Design a protein around this ligand. Structure first.
Ligand code: FES
Ligand code: FES
Lengths: 127, 127
């Protein structure tokens, strides 16, 4: 078939066994981003110690591509400085996502956009 | 707030720990239904013995409401006669779903529509 799309092993691994699902109570930074098409919401929670991500959790009721990408992005963010985590985007897990249905590119961008939002929330509370 | 919506404990239980996720190889009936808005696909697989559902599995990369509803519908279908399973719809788990965002009503209908499709696939193979 032409323009074939579908789901890779790595996305299926992170959708079936996502890392860092949950909530942090009273988090240092909280970010939430929604997807305009389906209305699902991605929420990222961070604890910050030493200017670094000491803990991270995500919560969403969105689709498999959004959950797998959040699992991969939160795992890559853990332990990074705030400036390094701000540079993380789904480009950093491009190979795992290649091939996905084209509408899931937006779903894949929720995790990094919520992480950036959580970092900015924490920074704006510093001031 | 007015017209409040969100996710209940029962849906969160079935999204976090869905029952009957997987595939049956060489199934007796296979049904697949898609959601027009997001393009996700729900697939149900059944094994039929004694005119009854001897095993059932679903596979989707759709959202939390579609995965929780499939978990609840496949659990209710297991062991039922084909005629009883044909009567199952998300109405049978209405109370667990009440309150969900209104766009997830379509996501909630995928499981029973795929189950009906799998049953009709098996019947059309009888003939
Ligand atoms: S379909 Fe809602 S987050 Fe992907
Ligand atoms: S948003 Fe795709 S199945 Fe619900």
């Amino acid at each position: 078939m032409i323009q074939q799309t579908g789901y890779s092993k790595k996305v299926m691994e992170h959708f079936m066994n996502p890392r860092n699902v949950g909530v942090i109570d009273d988090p240092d930074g909280y970010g939430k981003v929604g997807n305009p098409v389906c209305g699902d919401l991605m929420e990222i929670f961070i604890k910050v110690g030493d200017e670094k991500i000491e803990d991270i959790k995500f919560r969403t009721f969105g689709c498999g591509a959004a959950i797998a990408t959040s699992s991969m992005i939160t795992e890559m963010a853990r332990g990074k400085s705030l400036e390094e985590a701000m540079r993380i985007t789904r480009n950093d897990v491009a190979d795992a996502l290649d091939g996905l249905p084209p509408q899931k590119m937006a779903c894949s961008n929720l995790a990094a956009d919520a992480l950036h939002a959580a970092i900015n929330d924490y920074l704006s509370k510093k001031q």
